[PDB]
Amino acid sequence: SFEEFTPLNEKSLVDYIKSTPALSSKIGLVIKEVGDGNLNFVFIVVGSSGSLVIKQALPYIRCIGESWPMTKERAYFEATTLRKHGNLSPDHVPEVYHFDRTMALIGMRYLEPPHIILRKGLIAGIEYPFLADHMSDYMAKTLFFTSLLYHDTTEHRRAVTEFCGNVELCRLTEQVVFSDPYRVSTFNRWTSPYLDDDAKAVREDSALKLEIAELKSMFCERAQALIHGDLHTGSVMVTQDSTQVIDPEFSFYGPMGFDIGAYLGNLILAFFAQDGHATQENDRKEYKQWILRTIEQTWNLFNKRFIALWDQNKDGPGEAYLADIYNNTEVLKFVQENYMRNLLHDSLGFGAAKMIRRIVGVAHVEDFESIEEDKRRAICERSALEFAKMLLKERRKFKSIGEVVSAIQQQ
Amino acid sequence: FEEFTPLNEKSLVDYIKSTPALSSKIGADKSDDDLVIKEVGDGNLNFVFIVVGSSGSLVIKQALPYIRCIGESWPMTKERAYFEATTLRKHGNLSPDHVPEVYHFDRTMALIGMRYLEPPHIILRKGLIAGIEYPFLADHMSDYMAKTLFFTSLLYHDTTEHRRAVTEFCGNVELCRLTEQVVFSDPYRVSTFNRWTSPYLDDDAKAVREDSALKLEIAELKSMFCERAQALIHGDLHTGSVMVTQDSTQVIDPEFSFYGPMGFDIGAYLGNLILAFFAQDGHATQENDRKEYKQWILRTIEQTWNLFNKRFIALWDQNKDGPGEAYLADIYNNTEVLKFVQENYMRNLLHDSLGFGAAKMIRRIVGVAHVEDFESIEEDKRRAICERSALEFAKMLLKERRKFKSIGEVVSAIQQQ
Ligand SMILES: Nc1ncnc2c1ncn2[C@@H]1O[C@H](COP(=O)(O)OP(=O)(O)O)[C@@H](O)[C@H]1O
Ligand SMILES: Nc1ncnc2c1ncn2[C@@H]1O[C@H](COP(=O)(O)OP(=O)(O)O)[C@@H](O)[C@H]1O
Ligand SMILES: CSC[C@H]1O[C@H](O)[C@H](O)[C@@H]1O
Ligand SMILES: CSC[C@H]1O[C@H](O)[C@H](O)[C@@H]1O
Ligand SMILES: [Cl-]
Ligand SMILES: [Cl-]
Ligand SMILES: [Mg+2]
Ligand SMILES: [Mg+2]
Ligand SMILES: [Mg+2]
Ligand SMILES: [Mg+2]
Ligand SMILES: [Mg+2]
């Protein structure tokens, strides 16, 4: 099925693959649709000589249906960023085998069992000993090398031009992250009646509304790096020794803190969900401490690794901090410490915004939704929401991730 | 004229005659009268001709593939003329009384035909040097700035429109790179392009390239210049980009335009008014000591910002239910919260404006492209004394701008200098 866009299912996919040498060659069929995400269709294909994943975008948001159109052109941006981020961090992104723009279809490496979505592992109370290492490396490489710390402004502008094409998905985010939680919307939902007052407070908080508008402006305006754009714990697949970032379909030239914040923010949601998963056998007290350690280490390793790349590449081609200006170790370290403190504050801000929108908005997270009892869920959700409102408003007071972790504990 | 060819006073006659949009404006198509054509471009980049016919007058501007003031050794795409013509039309639609009308654009020839801002219009910078007051200037410039910046921002654009507009203006990258070098980089290092009144400013230039706090601020502003698509900025809005009479104010030369930070325009303009203030003692004579004129400059600065602040807010209020998505009406949903976010936005905008303004002052004093305000002070030592006061003020302002809560406080600091 090739010449015009065709929505595929488990059996027409057979014919498409057979007609596509790049894909048929990779597996030489058992087909199962397994997409549990919000937007797209994903198929595991096996395979005489191998296996693969087929992802296809339809012209609307899958979790809503046809009343919410969304260009299938997002698949092009997903494939572009899987390749670009993959080039930079090949150990942490699934290889792309094939892209068909007409079909809005991507063929890519199947992340084989025992790979699971990280969010699920966090719900299950499983520790991932390489997670802080792998994720800090991924974020450092992808954000540093697509920033003006490495790009000259000619290539940066060329890349911005390209990614302005992903405006429809940017528009989805502008609505669901930066707008809906702060107003009345038929799309919003929360554990009710428990969080009714909580949701009203969010849409009546002036200081909160100021901060979200500033972050929304930065999202819409600031071409800082090629961000993944949806870097929550549902966008990471893991085993005890493998960490793979998937689903960069929301990618564009945006603020770095949006990725770091999405990821750290979702770890913070995991932390606040834990009490709702506690049992007689596992009270989650030690696991909660592990999550806090992973948050602290992810940021601290990221900071160290990002600066290491900057130091390694201080003598071009990036033009943001020209070496004959920032020309001794003292002034360079001074400007770096400033840059990283601002990046921490941006990250906490976007992280807090993502936490808020998960609790009162259209798209919730499994960490809380898998807590069956509404009352128990609401207690955990309220703790997370109170923390997130404080963080959004007060983040510039924090000098370190250690201070953020202390604040989480005092909540 | 199917291929690009540089025009001169003689060959332009033939170009006009082959071009109905031009010949008809001046009478060349129905009269045999000789056209009177004079090349008058005194700017840094392009060639500008005044054309006078029997029945009208016009200006022809042409870009060549290099920076005029440097010569062929500094290439610069002639495609800049496309961006100039685009922004003349776009800003002109928004502030029609303060931008010259475009009659003709020829992309191949990199050529614009536009309204001749006739005598006694002179460049504002020359009027400031001459000690001429312009009673309408704060009114006109504040309105010009509020209109051009508000209506091309996310307070008015939806993000689909904004992304489309950014895509287009990313093509003006070569001129952005010129500014990235000369404004944001060269003054803070050794460069063969840098120049200053020597030896008198040698220590001052060295201090700029040794000032860590200053280097931090310029890096953050450079990042904002390179990354932040806030509005369609003119991109070169100094006092040499404004032409004036007692009752007319016209903004010219938006060739550097792109989607950048609003403060870069406001700061370019106010920063050059501040340069003019600091140059005034250098132009003083026993007959006109410039003391009253200096106070006039300070009033115009204060009035320009204060009028801009309220007029920008007025457009925001007026378009609060309009298509802009930056501050959605059902979120910022009462008059009190809207004023609260507006006040913060405008404070940040003042700080951005003061930072870019200070950056432009610094680059005019130690960099490749100086201003007539100082260069027209004949005596080197006398010029350096005025230049130093300006530079010392600009360094303070770049570093300390966030302490200022009003333009009045900035004006007091200038008076304290
Ligand atoms: N390369 C892959 N290998 C294994 N499983 C995958 C792969 N890509 C996606 N999946 C599975 O498909 C689900 C949805 O994929 P995702 O790309 O997140 O789609 P959406 O864009 O709809 O969120 C994931 O939760 C995971 O279970
Ligand atoms: N529309 C106009 N009407 C009258 N004079 C003009 C007009 N446009 C330009 N000029 C004159 O040409 C000079 C240079 O024009 P400008 O557009 O600033 O060129 P540049 O891009 O080279 O700086 C101005 O200082 C002014 O004297
Ligand atoms: C209607 S919002 C859909 C959500 O799912 C995507 O993965 C993004 O997180 C988006 O906000
Ligand atoms: C080489 S710098 C030339 C200067 O003239 C233009 O008008 C801009 O101001 C530019 O910085
Ligand atoms: Cl999220
Ligand atoms: Cl200037
Ligand atoms: Mg997903
Ligand atoms: Mg997705
Ligand atoms: Mg000019
Ligand atoms: Mg000395
Ligand atoms: Mg010019």
H helices within A361-411, ranges in order? 366-369, 374-394, 401-410
Q: How many CB atoms lie within 10 A of CB B145?
A: 27
Within an 8 Å CB–CB cutoff, is residue B314 touching chain A? no
Instruction: For strands B36-39 and B47-52, give the pairing.
Output: antiparallel
User: Token pair for residue A240?
Assistant: 């005890």
User: Do A145 and A64 belong together in one domain?
Assistant: no
Cβ atoms of B135 and B115 closer than 8 Å: no
Cα(A49)–Cα(A28) distance, integer angstroms: 5
Q: Which residues contact B90 (CB under 8 A, 6 or more apart)?
A: B152, B232
Helix (H) or strand (E) holding A358: helix A329-360
Cα(A212)–Cα(A228) distance, integer angstroms: 20
User: Do A352 and A208 belong together in one domain?
Assistant: yes
User: Token pair for residue A52?
Assistant: 């693969």
Cα(B110)–Cα(B90) distance, integer angstroms: 18
Which of B159, B167, B331 comes nearest A174 by C-beta? B159
Binding-site annotation: residue ranges of A for ATP: 36-40, 55, 109-111, 247-249
Cβ atoms of A171 and B159 closer than 8 Å: yes
User: Token pair for residue A200?
Assistant: 């009203």
Residue count (chain A): 411
Judged by DSSP in three states, A306 sits in helix
Where does residue B286 rank: exposed (0-12), middle (13-18), buried (19+ CB within 10 A)? exposed
From A57, A79, A114, give the residue that closes a domain: A114
User: Do A244 and A393 belong together in one domain?
Assistant: yes
Q: Which residues contact B80 (CB under 8 A, 6 or more apart)?
A: B45, B63, B110, B172, B174, B175, B255, B256
Ligand 3 atom having least distance to the Cα of A361: 2
The CA-based angle A367-A78-A1, given to 5 degrees, is: 110
Cβ atoms of A102 and A4 closer than 8 Å: yes
From A114, A148, A175, give the residue that closes a domain: A114
Cβ atoms of A33 and A39 closer than 8 Å: no
Cα(A353)–Cα(A209) distance, integer angstroms: 11
Q: Which of A271, A153, A292, A289 is nearest to A223 (CA)?
A: A153
B338-343: list long-range contacts, CB under 8 Å, 24+ apart: B340/A206, B340/A210, B341/A209, B341/A210, B341/A213, B342/B313, B342/B316
User: Do A119 and A104 belong together in one domain?
Assistant: no
Q: How far is the CA of B69 from the centre of ligand 2 (A)?
A: 14
Cβ atoms of A62 and A83 closer than 8 Å: no
User: Are B176 and A183 within 8 A, CB to CB?
Assistant: no
Indicate if ligand 1 lies below 6 Å from the C-beta of A229: no
User: Do A43 and A149 belong together in one domain?
Assistant: no
User: Do B269 and B311 belong together in one domain?
Assistant: yes
User: Token pair for residue A370?
Assistant: 């898998």
Q: How far is the CA of B384 from the centre of ligand 10 (A)?
A: 14
Cα(B158)–Cα(B170) distance, integer angstroms: 18
Report the residue among B47, B99, B253, B370 best suited for mutation to probe ligand 2: largest number of ligand atoms under 8 A from its CB. Answer: B253
User: Do A126 and A1 belong together in one domain?
Assistant: no
Q: In the block, which residue shows the tokens 């063929």?
A: A107
Give the 3-state DSSP-derived string for chain B, with helices as H, strands as E and coil as C: CCCCCCCCCCHHHHHHHCCHHHHHHHCCCCCCCCCEEEECCCCCCCEEEEEECCCCEEEEEECCCECCCCCCCCECCCCHHHHHHHHHHHHHHHCHHHCCCEEEEECCCCEEEECCCCCCCEEHHHHHHHCCCCCCHHHHHHHHHHHHHHCCCCCCCCHHHHHHHHHHHHHHHHHHHHHHHHCCCHHHCCCCCCCCCCCCCHHHHHHHCCCHHHHHHHHHHHHHHHHECCEEECCCCCHHHEEECCCCEEECCCCCCEEECHHHHHHHHHHHHHHHHHHHHHHCCCCCCCHHHHHHHHHHHHHHHHHHHHHHHHHHHHCCCCCCCCCCCCCCCCHHHHHHHHHHHHHHHHHHHHHHHHHHHHHHHHCCCCCHHHHCCCCHHHHHHHHHHHHHHHHHHHHHHHHCCCHHHHHHHHHHC
Give the distance from CA A164 to its chain's centroid.
19
H helices within A183-322, ranges in order? 196-202, 206-221, 257-273, 285-312
Residue count (chain B): 417
Cβ atoms of A56 and A103 closer than 8 Å: yes
User: Token pair for residue A45?
Assistant: 């294909």
Task: Tell me how far apart the terminal alpha carbons of chain B are, to the nearest angstrom.
Answer: 55
User: Do B44 and B127 belong together in one domain?
Assistant: no
Q: Whose CA is nearest to atom 6 of ligand 4?
A: B44
Cα(A191)–Cα(B290) distance, integer angstroms: 71
Ligand 1 atom having least distance to the Cα of A62: 22
Instruction: For strands B249-251 and B36-39, give the pairing.
Output: unpaired
Which of B177, B216, B229 comes nearest A221 by C-beta? B229
Cα(B51)–Cα(B16) distance, integer angstroms: 9
For residue B366, give the CATH number of its domain.
3.90.1200.10
Judged by DSSP in three states, A47 sits in coil
Judged by DSSP in three states, A101 sits in coil
Cβ atoms of A191 and A377 closer than 8 Å: yes
DSSP 3-state helix, strand, coil percentages of chain A (rounded to 5)? 55, 10, 35
Instruction: For strands A51-56 and A96-100, give the pairing.
Output: unpaired
Q: Whose CA is nearest to atom 7 of ligand 4?
A: B44
Ligand 2 atom having least distance to the Cα of B241: 18
- By what method was this entry solved? X-ray
Cβ atoms of A177 and A231 closer than 8 Å: no
Residue ranges making up the domain that contains B157: 121-417
Report the residue among A116, A117, A246 best suited for mutation to probe ligand 1: largest number of ligand atoms under 8 A from its CB. Answer: A246
Q: Which amino acid is at B5?
A: T
Rg (CA), chain A: 21
For residue B13, give the CATH number of its domain.
3.30.200.20
Q: Which ligand is nearest to the CA of B125?
A: 2
Cα(B81)–Cα(B109) distance, integer angstroms: 9
Residues of B in contact with A209 (CB under 8 A): 331-332, 337, 341
Q: In the block, which residue shows the tokens 């450092």?
A: A140
Ligand 11 (ion): which residues have CB within 5 A? B 45, 253, 255
Cα(A13)–Cα(A6) distance, integer angstroms: 10
User: Do A213 and A283 belong together in one domain?
Assistant: yes
User: Do B331 and B215 belong together in one domain?
Assistant: yes
From A114, A134, A155, give the residue that closes a domain: A114
Q: Which amino acid is at A10?
A: E
Across A338-365, b (16+ Cβ under 10 Å) vs e yields: ebbeebbbbbbbbbbbbbbbbbbbbbbb
The residues facing B233 across adjacent strands are B258
Across A104-135, b (16+ Cβ under 10 Å) vs e yields: bbbbbbbbeeebebbbbbbbebeebeebbebb
The residues facing A100 across adjacent strands are A105
Question: From the CA of A132, how many Å to the nearest CA of chain B?
Answer: 29
DSSP secondary structure, A158-214, as one string: HHHHHHGGGHHHHHHHHHHTTTGGGS--TT---STTTTHHHHHHHTT-HHHHHHHHH
The number of folded domains in chain A is 2
Sheet with B242-244, strands from edge to edge, namely B122-123, B242-244, B249-251
Cβ atoms of B16 and B22 closer than 8 Å: yes
User: Do A137 and A94 belong together in one domain?
Assistant: no
The residues facing B232 across adjacent strands are B259
Q: Which amino acid is at B248?
A: S
Q: Which of B240, B242, B310, B236 is nearest to B275 (CA)?
A: B240
Indicate if ligand 3 lies below 6 Å from the C-beta of A239: no
Cα(B154)–Cα(B8) distance, integer angstroms: 43
User: Token pair for residue B141?
Assistant: 């410039």
User: Do A143 and A16 belong together in one domain?
Assistant: no
Cβ < 6 A, ligand 4 pocket: B 44-45, 67, 178-179, 182, 236, 368-369
Task: Tell me how far apart the terminal alpha carbons of chain A are, to the nearest angstrom.
Answer: 55
Across A291-313, b (16+ Cβ under 10 Å) vs e yields: bbebbbbbbebbbebbbebbeee
